[PDB]
Amino acid sequence: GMLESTKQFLKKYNINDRVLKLYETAMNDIQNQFKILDDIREFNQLKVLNAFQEERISEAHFTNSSGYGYGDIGRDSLDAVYARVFNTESALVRPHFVNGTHALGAALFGNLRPGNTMLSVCGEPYDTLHDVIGITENSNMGSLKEFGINYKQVDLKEDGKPNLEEIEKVLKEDESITLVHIQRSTGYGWRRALLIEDIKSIVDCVKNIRKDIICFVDNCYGEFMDTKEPTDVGADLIAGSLIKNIGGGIAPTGGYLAGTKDCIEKTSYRLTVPGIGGECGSTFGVVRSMYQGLFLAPHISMEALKGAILCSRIMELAGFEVMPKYDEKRSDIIQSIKFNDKDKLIEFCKGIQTGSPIDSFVSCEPWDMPGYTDQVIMAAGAFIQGSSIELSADAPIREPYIAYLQGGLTFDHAKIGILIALSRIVK
Amino acid sequence: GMLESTKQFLKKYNINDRVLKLYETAMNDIQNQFKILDDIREFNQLKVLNAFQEERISEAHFTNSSGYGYGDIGRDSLDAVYARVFNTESALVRPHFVNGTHALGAALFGNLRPGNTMLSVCGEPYDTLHDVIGITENSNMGSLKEFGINYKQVDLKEDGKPNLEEIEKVLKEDESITLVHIQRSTGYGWRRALLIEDIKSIVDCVKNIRKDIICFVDNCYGEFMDTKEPTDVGADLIAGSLIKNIGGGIAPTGGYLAGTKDCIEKTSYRLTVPGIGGECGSTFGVVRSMYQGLFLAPHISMEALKGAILCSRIMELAGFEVMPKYDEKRSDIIQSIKFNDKDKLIEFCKGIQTGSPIDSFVSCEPWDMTDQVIMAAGAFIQGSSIELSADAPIREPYIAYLQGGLTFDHAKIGILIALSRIVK
Amino acid sequence: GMLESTKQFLKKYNINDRVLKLYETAMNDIQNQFKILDDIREFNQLKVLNAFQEERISEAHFTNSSGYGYGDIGRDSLDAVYARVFNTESALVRPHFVNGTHALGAALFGNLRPGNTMLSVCGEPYDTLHDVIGITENSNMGSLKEFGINYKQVDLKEDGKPNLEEIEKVLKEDESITLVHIQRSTGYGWRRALLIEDIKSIVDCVKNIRKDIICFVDNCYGEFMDTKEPTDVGADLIAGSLIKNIGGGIAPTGGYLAGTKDCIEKTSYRLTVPGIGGECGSTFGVVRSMYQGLFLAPHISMEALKGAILCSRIMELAGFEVMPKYDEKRSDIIQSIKFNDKDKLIEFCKGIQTGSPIDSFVSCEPWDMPGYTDQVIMAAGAFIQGSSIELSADAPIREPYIAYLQGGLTFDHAKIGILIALSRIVK
Amino acid sequence: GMLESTKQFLKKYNINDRVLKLYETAMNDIQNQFKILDDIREFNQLKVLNAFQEERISEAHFTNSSGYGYGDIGRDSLDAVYARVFNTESALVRPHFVNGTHALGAALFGNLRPGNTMLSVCGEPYDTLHDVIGITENSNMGSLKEFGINYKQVDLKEDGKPNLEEIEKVLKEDESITLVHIQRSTGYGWRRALLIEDIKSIVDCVKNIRKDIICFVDNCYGEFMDTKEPTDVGADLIAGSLIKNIGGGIAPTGGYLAGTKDCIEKTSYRLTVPGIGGECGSTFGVVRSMYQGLFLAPHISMEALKGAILCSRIMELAGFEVMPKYDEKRSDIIQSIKFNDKDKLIEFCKGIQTGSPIDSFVSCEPWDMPGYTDQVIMAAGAFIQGSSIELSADAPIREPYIAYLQGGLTFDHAKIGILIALSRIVK
């Protein structure tokens, strides 16, 4: 149990006895969930190891390609390793994707053509994808809508599960629909992420209407949450970011897609241009970090999830509503806390900032950010800028004052920040 | 003049006295042209220095940049430096462009929309752009044509200059034309590159028909050939590769665009996606090389060009037809030599290969890529055109295209090694 | 517990039921030791976090210095962070150290002068240090001995503890002794690493004869094994390698020293030259990885230690003699196994090679090492070449056939490797 | 000639007609001196190309080694290329040398042992070497003197030439002298740099007394000034900085030595430790820039020298004493200007900073630079910090107020900077 020396050290952070008791109770309560996670982690570590070994990765794959990067074996074998991990025909892993949204956008523009319609089946996509699609606003930035590609949407049911009957009806009534988009993570929605079994039910439902419909999954935040990925239950294409789970906290930028050879090649032509695709693109010497990040990903992903589960339990014990609960099956690393008080939300986030190794001294306050209307507060202090796998928090400043917390390179770090933050509002 | 020690050293590369006499004559003949280049180089060096200074570039700009790269001053200031050099509202310089074709394609998809038509006014664009446009064939890769964007073409007059009369006709007769594509370099052809004055006449001509038509120039190989760039004579947007002239021999990958804020932003949305544009994108630890490459570019571009000029004159003196001539105004660093003999063309390329610092020893032979191609290449940066290289499709009349040379001495050495394999 | 999917996947590596039974028993036995390690890790994570926060580390410290490296705040602050972690006046952390031996040699040549004598109090130091000192070979390479600096040695007692009485006797009789060398880790010794309390007893004993005697500790493999470091119990100077524990699996090269300002400055003059010391030395843009490595070090060190503890117990249960035993206090991450059979030793190492992500397919056979009459066999397949914190094994091919196993970026990886290896010798 | 647009652009830097006319006159006067330089540059370019080709350099040599760097072909082949360029048995080219003083000091400590005496034959060495040797001051930093290695000095003659008769007398009278140190460049003096023929005369003289005396040359700033290097006229060992000539303006840090295998090995054991030497040492991903820099060095070295010659003649015409004159044979890239006025001096250096691409707005001032007695002002607006192959100027603050100008990646840049600087003092 916690050392007396550690207790004294935490007192210098103003962590009080009431918070320590809540922590001891929460740790005791969540032990069985941690064991479930360790069983999954064990399988995923083996899965990833096997993929490296099947590709015969060697020292020589730590390339330092320049120029066109023709024949960069490090890049080509990393794609192969990912495709093995995800059990897909192909993959496309590049530092050139600037963020996860870029990878998703490349998938969409890559696989859609004028006259086609895409169908999002988990309600409204996260905000940044809205400009990519041209859902509401269009200002000639060149959205899907501006290239004659249409958008439709089926919301999740009241219970948070996909509306399979409506999905079928919408597909049957519109034969122009060639792509179904499934967001795995909840985003800022007060509901559960979709479980792998839910993604399967969706794909089976879609494929039963027209087998040729491409089932695309935004896999961000869901890597290594289960022993299966969406590609193990019928997904034709998935996309994600290398500064979230799959980079293991160390890939410095980039993104990935895994799926059928056709979907990947089509995506590659949007990443670069038709006729080039993924054949060109040197990797700036960062390929070693991308291999290593993948190898560490199953473990680091669970450190962060463990942080989320402790957060869920401890905040519940402190009297705050939380989503998800500590014992629910999770499909992402995000934890939401309803403070129901603006000041508590602000102080909690400030606490998280002070618990960061980087920029721990920085002003953490509400600010107006481009196109949000409501102010936003963000705690971030990472080794890799914008990394979601490193402890961070964000919240719109509006009723009922919900904060979203994610990451933690280690469970001990996430725990420490959580204790600092909670001590700012519970004493 | 050439030291006796150098001559004896060159003898070890089988360089003979006949080749040395041709070299001597060529050097005498091309000195006035070198002086002309030096006057341009001096101005361009100042222009680039001033762009750095106006942007107050400092050591702090050689930033460690990771993740999203939100607020990356290294990247942001480099865009501002390029905008100053080219005298444009904005610029987009990124290591994320995998090659020059990506930069050009990004400009075209970025600035065209369904129903618009683009017009290429220097005949058909270089080959790799054909799949991007969807010119001849289409296999659902997502070409401009597959997104409802149309393509038209006006060829250069038989004298190599723009057909202004036909451009006007085609524009007046098709109001759906919203962009005019101008290729500055010659490509695998046999004509002069377009001079800045020629570019200006095309722009003035086009804007006189409809002032809203975007005039886009593929500037590859043309950087620092003149004291003006196409953006100085009305181009709305230009694109290029950082492993050609503008990288100064040291930028390791990437491309650039310079132009109006609207055109540059639209391009950025194709580079990434609508709503992100150029706001995200870390620079991978290579930003210092990109800045330093720019600073050296005016100088290095002329080392390569002097190489081309010497090549032109010595091969002319050797008895071959060369394009362009040693004393013509140039708008690119490429030199063509017509061998009228397959073996002489092959040997020459093998000579260039053996004159490279990297992969000097590698077999240089024709390979399949309709006709076979042969390429001499041995560079620090893979595929760099500013480093000494040669390529030639194997077909009548056996024309080779030579370009690059980090230093004039290196280009010279390669030329003398190559010519010695055929003039004995 | 272990999923059925995991058991079937492991069956593909020829892992058998007897090995899985041994495994389940060993996991049951070691859970209390793992909890003790978690308590120490929690403290150390906080210690490192605190060191970052006190130095107000920001993204601005992730420098990309060039040339002379004058005023490189990234490098300077990293030294300050390490000094806080080790509670020393100063520290010298540089990528310029090519390995741990270099760092140790810099300390010795830095702090010794003609006529001085150094005393190693833990028996003979590991082999690579012999040429530095000039113990056996003196071929004008410029050893301490070739510079007029003498060497004396005091072996450990039969029980493996320091011979305090003999240390005093030798120090009293030889007033030229100005530095005492203490090796924390064991080497080829079938004995335990020295505990922090043992190091304290040596320092107390030495300072009580002459307070000015420099007490120097080779800290390799010992970082974060305890909540205290040798500098917390009076060591004047310590040295280590960044591709061992303290680089957290991600530092790409380099070494560190931490200690009094005088000792560190004197070391810096050997690293470079007198009058320059640590004032020049750009850091190639690898400083971020060094900071992140340190931050992950408390956690990664314990992933490796958990693999060593598992190895100890499962091998003991398999019938092999092991050093240390699963429940002894540890001062390093190394686990020794006495096979008493050349073939089993070789098969075990082959197994570890087949469980690596990198070079899993390369032949692992004994080979002739320059200047040694016993062949050596080594299993190695790392992201960072030569890293001791990634799973690896090595053995000199001699009776009684003892292998040394260390590393494991994640406990799951070390575990997988051990299971693959044991299955090659226990059916 | 200069374009009118260029003249108008220059007027925006407050460059006046008097300075432009001085420039025009100077260029006319020095043109013939440049022809000589191009003949040398041509040979040197071929010399370097040949060395690359003999070593069969390929893209495979652009290594990205990590950890120990064992078996790094990029590093090993670069040493071989250097050795061919300098016509020596061996070479040691490493990013690990922090500056040129480090490389020189490693040579001396590497090759001298207690009882040996070194003899500097060009008068007092460059400032930063005084602490390395222990000439005057000794504060237990570990100078040669503190390790029992003695120092003697023979000054140059009043005419600046080597005093061969005195060298002979000193060597004959002291058989403990085992190394002769020869400085090629003048440092902060007022004399001409030693030509290759002067270096030969010293080597022949020394070897005629005792063939076993190591002839060591500090080659900084002299690389590619002639078709020969000191190793072509009998030097056993030479050393220099990769941020001066031989780095070609792109090597980011480091040093080199070239010479006999025995002298290079002995230096390597000081750079690291005995028993390791040059066998360990990963190269931080910068090896490609070191190869590329060497290839550009013959050219860039002459761009800087053309700048020095222009500076000589334009300042002479302006009315200042200069050393050397525009038409003297040069053995380094440095140009000295005696202002005999502290104000004109600091103003000139400030002009140079304002003529630089990087940090043009920083107003440079005198500072306590590591390794110097008095305060020196340095103009150093560079891509690589402290690089003196990039346009720079430095000047100890003391009578007669001599400024030392060197560098220029292009002659056009050196020209522009000289005009900017002179315009601040001449109107």
UniProtKB/TrEMBL annotation, chains A, C, D:
InterPro entries: Met_g_lyase_put, PyrdxlP-dep_Trfase, PyrdxlP-dep_Trfase_major. This is Aluminum resistance protein. Pyridoxal 5'-phosphate binds at residues 68, 100-101, 126. It holds the Pfam family Met_gamma_lyase. The lineage of its organism: Bacteria, Bacillati, Bacillota, Clostridia, Eubacteriales. It comes from the Bacteria.
From TrEMBL, chain B:
Pyridoxal 5'-phosphate binds at residues 68, 100-101, 126. It holds the Pfam family Met_gamma_lyase. This is Aluminum resistance protein. PANTHER family: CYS OR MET METABOLISM PYRIDOXAL-PHOSPHATE-DEPENDENT ENZYME. InterPro entries: Met_g_lyase_put, PyrdxlP-dep_Trfase, PyrdxlP-dep_Trfase_major.
